[PDB]
């Protein structure tokens, strides 16, 4: 029963979530440019 | 109390999982970026 260590672990976890939100936005930005560039590529199967 | 502690441990496991996914998506994404330099339009 840490009493207050739980508040701190929650605060820390939220920081990890903030990080993952930033990473996810950044991955999406890069993915979106590949999609836009991919419309002009020659695809031949 | 112990249901909350267990939820915290589980949540951190879910966060670890998502960190690995992000790393893996980036690795795969980097190869498409490298290849895209040689592309015909």
């Amino acid at each position: 029963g840490d009493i207050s260590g739980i508040n701190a672990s929650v605060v820390n976890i939220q920081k990890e979530i903030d990080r993952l939100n930033e990473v996810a936005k950044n991955l999406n930005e890069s993915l979106i440019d590949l999609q836009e560039l991919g419309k002009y590529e020659q695809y031949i199967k | 109390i112990s249901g909350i502690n267990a939820s915290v441990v589980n949540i951190q496991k879910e966060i670890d999982r998502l960190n690995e996914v992000a790393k893996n998506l980036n690795e795969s994404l980097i190869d498409l970026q490298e290849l895209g330099k040689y592309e015909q339009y």
Partner: nanobody
Amino acid sequence: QVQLQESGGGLVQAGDSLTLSCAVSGRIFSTYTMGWFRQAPGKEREFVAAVRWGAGTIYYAGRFTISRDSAKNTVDLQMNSTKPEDTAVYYCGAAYVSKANYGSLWYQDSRRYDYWGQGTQVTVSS
């Protein structure tokens, strides 16, 4: 595939303004980001400014104004009130897609660019 050609450098009196220009040749797409960097004596390549080719989003590292003309296919760097600290070789670079997967400040990292101009010397005389 793009080629970059800087122009407009040379001698400039301190306090005066100067405009550099980068002529982009080849296949430009909306995904491109053009960045201006400078290499001053004794320091590392410094990010100055960048502009996203499609949307026109601009990023700065005050005295400098970047803009792009998508009709003429140029990127311009206007240097206002030049200072002796502005003496450097200036480089135009192009990244063909967003490299934000490397971080939100990716466009400040010269390694994230794919094509480079040859560089133009600017010398501020006092």
